[PDB]
Design an enzyme around this catalytic site. Structure first.
Site, PDB file in Angstrom:
ATOM      1  N   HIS B  35      -8.659  11.973  -9.896  1.00  0.00           N
ATOM      2  CA  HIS B  35      -8.393  11.004  -8.856  1.00  0.00           C
ATOM      3  C   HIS B  35      -8.494  11.869  -7.608  1.00  0.00           C
ATOM      4  O   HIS B  35      -7.855  12.922  -7.521  1.00  0.00           O
ATOM      5  CB  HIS B  35      -6.984  10.428  -8.962  1.00  0.00           C
ATOM      6  CG  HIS B  35      -6.536   9.739  -7.712  1.00  0.00           C
ATOM      7  ND1 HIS B  35      -7.016   8.507  -7.323  1.00  0.00           N
ATOM      8  CD2 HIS B  35      -5.698  10.145  -6.727  1.00  0.00           C
ATOM      9  CE1 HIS B  35      -6.495   8.183  -6.152  1.00  0.00           C
ATOM     10  NE2 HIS B  35      -5.693   9.161  -5.769  1.00  0.00           N
ATOM     11  N   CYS B 105     -11.722   5.304  -6.857  1.00  0.00           N
ATOM     12  CA  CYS B 105     -11.263   6.198  -5.795  1.00  0.00           C
ATOM     13  C   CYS B 105     -12.282   7.299  -5.493  1.00  0.00           C
ATOM     14  O   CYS B 105     -12.398   7.755  -4.358  1.00  0.00           O
ATOM     15  CB  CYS B 105      -9.931   6.835  -6.191  1.00  0.00           C
ATOM     16  SG  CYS B 105     -10.068   7.985  -7.578  1.00  0.00           S
TER      17      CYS B 105
END
Lengths: 158, 158
Positions: B35, B105
């Site tokens: 992430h 993301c």
């Protein structure tokens, strides 16, 4: 009084994988990653990151449910039900309120079942989050798990 | 021209668990569930189910990043950057557009890095989704994985 059957559609999101890989990840035997929905008045209703949504039964990307559970009958009519869901969607079940552990699709179905039939759904389903949390696995992934939102595609807002 | 350093904050959502349990779940060695976010002009920016959000660096529930990667310098000022993010948030990066595999993301950070520095972020990060998908594991959990939305708490809308 007119009676309408209420069903709980049960989906194992892991499609059996959680069944075998649970002892090797959490060191505990889980039978599945339960996602449920309420089926009443010929439609399926569920809660996700998008809020309360509906679709024809078995109409999401998940396909047919793994199990159809009989909750009971309700006297609540369709128009009264939609008004009820609308009220929930504007108060405690906006999409923003979704939480993998404490305010998920099962939190929704459980509260809806109680309203429609006076009965709660099975604890093995609603207690799943706490079972995962009470493990080193769950404690380590807590930050990540709390960042997870679930929204099966295929439904439309209520 | 005034130059502003651009950093890529890298987070392993699995906190090392994917490193050891990946061979036993996917039968392939993955090093983490990446992430990422872009840190520029003293703030952290990321994309999730809530859309584009910002927070003080390392200010989400995830805590400090596992790695801070230098992307390069940019001449884009703060006001121009916010206008840029605003434009993205209203077009291709609304919360509704989030997809675990093709619009996550990292899709955001990669496109933002390219805009700010002309450079893309590392393929090992952006290719992760396809690596999971190209396995029996991924194919079986596709429906479930496609239902997953990620939004680390702690940020506020841009």
């Amino acid at each position: 009084p007119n009676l309408y059957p209420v069903k709980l559609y049960v989906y194992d999101l892991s499609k059996g994988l959680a069944r075998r890989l649970s002892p090797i990840m959490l060191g505990k035997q889980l039978e599945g990653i339960w996602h449920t929905s309420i089926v009443v008045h010929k439609d399926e209703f569920f809660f996700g990151s998008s809020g309360i949504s509906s679709c024809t039964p078995g109409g999401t990307l998940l396909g047919p449910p793994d199990s159809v559970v009989d909750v009971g009958n309700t006297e609540v009519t369709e128009e009264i039900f939609l008004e009820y869901l609308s009220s929930l969607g504007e108060s405690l079940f906006r999409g923003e309120a979704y939480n993998l552990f404490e305010h998920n699709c099962n939190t929704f179905s459980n509260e809806v079942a109680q309203f429609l039939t006076g009965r709660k759904i099975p604890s093995y389903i609603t207690d799943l989050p706490s079972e995962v949390l009470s493990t080193p696995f769950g404690q380590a992934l807590r930050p990540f798990l709390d960042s997870i939102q679930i929204q099966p595609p295929g439904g439309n807002s209520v």
